[PDB]
Design a binder for this molecule. Structure first.
Ligand SMILES: [Cl-]
Lengths: 216, 216, 216
């Protein structure tokens, strides 16, 4: 027996719950296991879109040895804090993908990714901890994505790009391909704004916007 | 018995007819009902892409009590005029979606929407009359879309956005999310240009272009 | 009996091989025919992502009268040179599409196209030799695409656009629709940059970037 959850019942979670149901009901063929929301804003349990929603204290109290959680909180500092709590409490991180999520050859993705509908992860990609790939995003050939990276919808991450930990890539941003000799790097904790057209390396902690991308 | 139609046999209609066939043949499981084009440019009936095409006078003359029409005319002033005519003539407005159109939880969409392939309508969205969501568009969580709104392909409408009646959002435009306390408003009859990167409220009747969006 | 290949084992080929397997195993229902990579960088055969990879000399030497090749090299000058070699050696050019590639009514596409996942080719489109439509691209109604045209991912080619031979359209570029009286032309060998917002005719051999597009 198993219990599943989506951690976060705000916009991120409510748009991922249908995806977690595709993952569980169709890709895993599991019509038996319950799935709930976890949200620490809750005191008493409520329902959100027809699913039971409870705080983490209550979720921990459930008498099941086999818990699986997708963290659906876009802020990567919160996501890392929750992931470390879950692992310490002996709860499994759970990767979810949609029926229309395309995974190509020789792809490695660490546990706990949220891979939305219409996402492509192309050939020979490596992805670290609790990746968020929102609707329509792609990661093309030979990319290396670090830990707690977050893509908004419709990110175009071309080939030979290395995105370091905790970077955020905004809606519809486009990133030029690197080369095998010079991968294009997005630095640790960088923020690439909605619609940015990135043609060069982004420094760690930089915020870049515009076409072409410039420091904000 | 029933008769279906796509109103408009120009580019909008010809790219929606396959979608109307997915809706009718697959999602409704109806291999019996006829589907035609209506276009008022026609005097004599013709064929368009292998479908009978006739003017509205001829469509009205068909002896069937049960007519269903998708209005495939992007201009929302024309669309409203035709919708009001159809309803007055006792003809039903007909929502169409593709096999790859994704509808999430607690979504309300008024009759007569054209929801293209690869469209996502995410959690807790409300949409008014004869919405057009062209190919690849999305409407994310908690949005409220009014009546006779029109999206070009690949619109990224993020969460907590309120788009008022008759707005037009151009190809690949990106709109920043609102918050629950302050939804980002696109005003009545506003035009958001192809590729616009919208980070603030757009006034009613404004035309905005660019990255970032500015008045044209 | 038949032998298939993807010509190019670099990023283009490695992200198309899964698509060629969808085309062959599912759309053609062929679980018998072998598929390999061809790459002229190879001296001795190797494996790439679990597929045999050989140079063209070795592929020619295979004793099969019935060879089918998808050219997965984005550079259109190389693609034309290889296509002419294949045809002269009595090898067939092979169109590939994905399970999520949508083709609408009255579409004509010459042999050897690479039509990626999530691509739409809309109504009444004509496409010439060895077209590349990378992930998420669309070609809308009434377009005429010439020979050896190349789209990066997420190109938005709206209706009534004529793209002449060897043009390249970069990631996420958006092109305004033409009209029936005045198709919007992208000239021979033009380059439209990543993220460009094209609102006017692009001259032959021009390089255009930005929002709005300007000469680079
Ligand atoms: Cl897309």
């Amino acid at each position: 027996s198993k219990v599943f959850a989506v951690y976060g019942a705000s916009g991120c979670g409510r748009s991922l719950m249908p995806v977690a149901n595709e993952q569980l009901r169709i890709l895993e063929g599991d019509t038996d296991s319950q799935i709930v929301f976890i949200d620490d804003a809750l005191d008493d349990n409520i329902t959100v879109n027809g699913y039971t929603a409870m705080n983490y204290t209550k979720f921990k109290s459930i008498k099941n040895d086999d818990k699986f959680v997708l963290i659906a909180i876009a802020n990567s500092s919160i996501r890392q804090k929750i992931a470390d709590k879950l692992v310490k409490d002996g709860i499994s991180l759970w990767t979810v993908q949609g029926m229309t999520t395309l995974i190509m050859d020789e792809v490695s993705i660490d546990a706990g990714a949220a891979l939305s509908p219409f996402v492509t992860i192309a050939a020979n990609v490596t992805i670290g901890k609790c990746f968020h790939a929102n609707l329509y995003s792609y990661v093309e050939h030979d990319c290396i994505i670090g830990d707690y990276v977050t893509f908004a919808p419709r990110v175009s991450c071309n080939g030979n790009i290395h995105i370091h930990d905790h970077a955020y890539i905004g809606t519809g941003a486009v990133i030029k391909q690197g080369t095998p000799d010079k991968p294009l790097i997005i630095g640790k904790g960088a923020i690439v704004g909605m619609g940015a057209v990135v043609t060069k390396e982004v420094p760690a902690g930089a915020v870049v916007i515009g076409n072409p991308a410039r420091l904000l």
